[model samples]
Target chain A: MRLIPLTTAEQVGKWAARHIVNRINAFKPTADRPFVLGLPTGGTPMTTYKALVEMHKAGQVSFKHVVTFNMDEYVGLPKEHPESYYSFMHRNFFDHVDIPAENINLLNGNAPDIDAECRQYEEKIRSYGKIHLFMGGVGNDGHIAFNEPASSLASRTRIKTLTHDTRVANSRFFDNDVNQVPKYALTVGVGTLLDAEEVMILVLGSQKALALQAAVEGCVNHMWTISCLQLHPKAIMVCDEPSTMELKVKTLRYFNELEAENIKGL
Target chain B: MRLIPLTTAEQVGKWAARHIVNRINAFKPTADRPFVLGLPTGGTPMTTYKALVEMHKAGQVSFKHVVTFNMDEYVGLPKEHPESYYSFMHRNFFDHVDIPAENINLLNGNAPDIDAECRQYEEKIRSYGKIHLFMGGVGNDGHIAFNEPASSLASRTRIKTLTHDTRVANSRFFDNDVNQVPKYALTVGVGTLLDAEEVMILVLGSQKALALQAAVEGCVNHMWTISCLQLHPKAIMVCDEPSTMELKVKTLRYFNELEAENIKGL
Candidate 1:
């Protein structure tokens, strides 16, 4: 919990890209085997992706051998649908970068046989001991992927309704028409998210103020599914100053200079 | 992080509503000051609001005074706007509950003059040295209020561009038009959100996996601004099993079990 607040989201982006790029290089000097990545859609991770692209453009990091697993997808839409997390990845990262087509794994939002699709998704995840980096976003309700509150940590990727808050929060992506937002989605579980060597979380703005407060301050409970990250071996939270300002005592301690000595920085 | 696995999203709604009904009673012996609150809008808190409303209907918590200050609001939108945080709170909480209209200090989103509006908003916040509790949602980027990453902790409630990610993430609320979403917003500074006497952050599901990881495991850098919760004097993270599975640390160590040690009376 080292509180390093920057002047703008771009600074945050550059820092994250540089750090992740450094990690990628350190992992494989020649970059032969692909680095398995857990990618997320939406605003926070977008800048990171942009920064990664920037690093790649600068010849500092190469994605030629990178493999990615998108965190979730709509249950009924095609991969090409505007709301599909699969399409989100392609538009934001895959299409922008030179990662091989075959190296990416996104849930088929329109999978004909839903059960089989979910099984294969789980099997593929099990084959990978741990992800190189896991990326994700918090639902307004603190949901990660589409796994809403009280969802089993051991749950697998499958179809489920988007909670009302989820639908509302995500409505911005659908032009503010709550009706258009998908009610159901397929998402990876917290178990899969934690099966990563490292995890990166990006958050910004006051819209996240209270949820951030509850997450960092309140007693850890299933009510907030994201709080499960307390069990991970290593995690990184990056944000602007104001976002960090509103946290409670324990969270405040993590952000103070004295607490920096105790932060986990693998 | 103590993970509490639940059967359905509805279970989350029911549990949350009941908790607030009881907790408010515990705090308010005579319904004094209406329990001044720092409120936020999003998925997790929505459930709580619903629960609170149920309690109100059942005559559990009386909110005669209940001075309230919402965390943030989009600039240029009226309280009547469907997307306005002001409207959301009213529709979801105040209208459903028995709180007084004069008690809320919601930021004026439709201010005719931005600078003056911000000054007034900040001034109002300055008067409240201790907000009873601040309830909120953590953005995908870990922001508490409009305090997007890179915003200064000492900033005042003022105009700011909704980060590209925020706008995109919120685009689902629009009619598929990214341009329509409010680009700027007014929100209390980190200074204000942190001023609350108590902070409770609620997180649910796996979508929040990476953000939680970053807040608990990563350094308090510009990357994970929401991790600022480490700065709070007293904080509690309420979560379920899956969401906590991805965290790197837990606030409670001496506890014998997740449920037992993390929470007791409350």
Candidate 2:
């Protein structure tokens, strides 16, 4: 596992955003083989999306043939709802970028058959052969996507029974009413996330310090799905200093020494 | 995860043997509610089997109402082959225990339909609701059962195309001739093992030091199937001092402090 311990959340965003732009540009993609990216929602990614838009407006990159798959969506949340991932994506990233309308792929949380929706999503991902880059965040409890504690590490895209902790945590986005939050969600599984050619995770705040520590130094466990990244051949963690509270100085120095020369943004 | 760091391989064997016996006796099982156990083969578990048989002779436990599932079998290896897991089980443990012939479940590596056999094994496992205890050993490369590195963590019972590393390593049992090793094996998947109600992994020797360290301190990754135990709520590790060579003193002290009261054999 490679770590990029940035000084602040703002720099983590630019570092990640610029890395994505560089990767997309380096690919020199065409319609026949466009870049495929896996993405996540919520505050963790908000700045990255802002930076990506900032770069887009600067004509530094284009998503003309790019395809995207969202990590998850709240079950039963209307697309029209301000807090809905669909709305969030449009309001924050998609609406401001040059990505084609047909290029976007988000879980249909309201699909008639949740199971079929999940299967279709898995198939859709497989149809592309692979996701070139998957970017994610660690929940306070270290969940990736919506893979709650004890969720099978080999699971595919599936419906998730949200933990009360998750529901209550998410209540912040739902007018601070846990009752307003959905009891379930549709999310890509840890196994699904592993299919990507590369993965980058952004975590901020001391609230997630233990999770960051677990990801870098704790046992590879399903309880902390973020630790699954340790198996990925090309997984990277971009985190702010506050989140590194639980990480060992020795662990930090090893990655820092390796990444020192390449720490600058693209 | 609790680590029972024994002073010697022999002690690891006794430690694991008595724990199994204790759990079984504590359950007070009956014909209608038999204890289901998952078993693994190879040198790592030989001493445990010996200890189990010795304990059985002392009337410490009864297997009359206990069912067993072997973790894996070499595909195409005859049941009568001395090196085959079936023969190993019968010669070392089952023959001395009171377990009924009908209570034994071994994967038929020589079955006409290997895929069907694999599927049947999975269904048979589910039929029992759950395995009360699963005991395993780690391959030098950190595989558990035949679930090799890069194997899907969510996989079920399946025929594995033996890795060259495994085939080469198993050559020692086949007159040191790699050609005599089977190219395939039927084994329980990491996912299958996780379904067990409790898991105990035994590792000995400095050769497995890296694997032990990875299991305890490395990220929960599919690359080291043994690491999957981190996700298991009731997983335990029985390792000798040699395997502790790669573990941190801090790690050793932590588990030692926690398991101090329960370290003695039953």
Candidate 3:
């Protein structure tokens, strides 16, 4: 159980963006060869996106050579839907960033052949071996993307039913109406997420305390998916004080502490 | 993205227990100021508890000042049921650990006043200001204890219907007889989980990868209760390679990394 505590949400957001830029620079994003990133959507990442846009405006980072592959999208909604991942990416990060549209690869929920879309999504991962960087947030029930707890361990970019908690939390994303939220979504599987070269996990606010602590401290069970990060050789956890409530040690170097330079970013 | 690749699953388990023990010390548990640790049953925490028992045996730690609040219990199963939380705790850790019976406070599904039992559970939490530490695990359905995604975020500790996913996942706990498993349970609500001072979340194996990522990386929806950890002051994530797939370099240092020394047994 490793706990990192931040004093404020804004601090959490800023560091997440800084790390993103740092990792991209470390990888040396090329114009002809765009860098691939695994991205996440929703309220939490909103802060990260804002930070990214701010960084871009300040000329600190360039997304021109970045290509994004989102973690998941609603299965039953049109990309035009207000809360759809497509609209979310464009409205939040993509439109503001310099990433090329053609370079972005996401599973199309509006695809006529959903199964084919899923297969192709898998194929893209198969071809790439891994995304350069993967980012994400957690659900109240501790899910990553639309990947609910009961999902198959071997699940890929397939559609799945949204649990009630998901729908309710997403309700705010759709004017606080759960019914308007899609019941299913197309998501990158746990297997696909594991293939990333570097991993960045962010948590903000006190709402995520229990599950956040569990993921970092509990046993080796498939249940709390975030606990899986213990594997990545170059993974880092960017969190605020409220989120890291359980892991914050009085010691400056609590648990296994390391400075940013000591950690190799992918 | 920062990756901290481990050599084996045992490494995850070993480090996880060590982290918990260290936290127990730093929490400053005392005879008068006992640490009320939240306990989750079934397959996940059993190993860690066993490891803790070994530490207790070796005099590395003491459970004398430890008080536990069981996360959830089967709704209809008799306390004597081998698969019940009562049985699970006793068999796995409670009986083996050095803690006295008076130090353990748990809800009994078969109590004369189940409703009253639930109230007492919440009351205990309210009086405690906040639980010192909460130990929990998530399911594929992103459930904590028996509070599946369907459970309300504002719910109180009470009886709940078991989702098919939950029932199936717990069937083995009932000896593989689906019929023997309870259809409902008494669990701490999401609200209650959030009231804890800290949460030690755990997830292991490739199967948990998606859920872990979602909880740590997704939105604050009801579906993934684990994501609620974003609200805690301190949370720890202890996992191996497969469970951390969704972590990227951007969020890793903020949320993913932890040190065992951070958790010192006072």
Candidate achieving the largest DockQ: 2
For residues B87-134, could you state the per-residue lDDT of candidate 1 as single tens digits?
Answer: 788778888776767777877877778789878866765565467777
What's the distance in Å from true for residue B61, model 1?
46
Model 3: per-residue Cα lDDT over B1-266, one tens digit each: 11223434565456567766887888878887877788887666656776777777888788888788888887767788787788878888877778898878778787778899899988877765678778777777576776767567677798888777766766786678677778878888877876776667777777877777766666445677776564344665566667766766544443333332332231
lDDT of candidates 1 onward, in order: 0.68, 0.88, 0.71
Which tens-of-lDDT digit does each residue in A107-173 have in candidate 1? 8878889889888987886675558888666765566777755444555677776766678878988
Clashing pairs in 2: A220-B219, A220-B220, A221-B220
**Ten consecutive residues with minimal summed lDDT in candidate 2 chain B?**
B257-266
TM-score of each: 0.48, 0.58, 0.49
Full candidate order by lDDT, most accurate first: 2, 3, 1
**Could you tell me which 10 consecutive residues in candidate 3 chain A have the lowest summed lDDT?**
A257-266
What's the ranking of the predictions by DockQ, best on top? 2, 3, 1
- Each candidate's B-chain TM-score, in sequence, is 0.84, 0.97, 0.86
Candidate 2, residue B48: how far the Cα is off, in Å: 22
- Tell me how each candidate scores on DockQ against the true complex: 0.02, 0.17, 0.02
- lDDT for B188 (candidate 3): 88
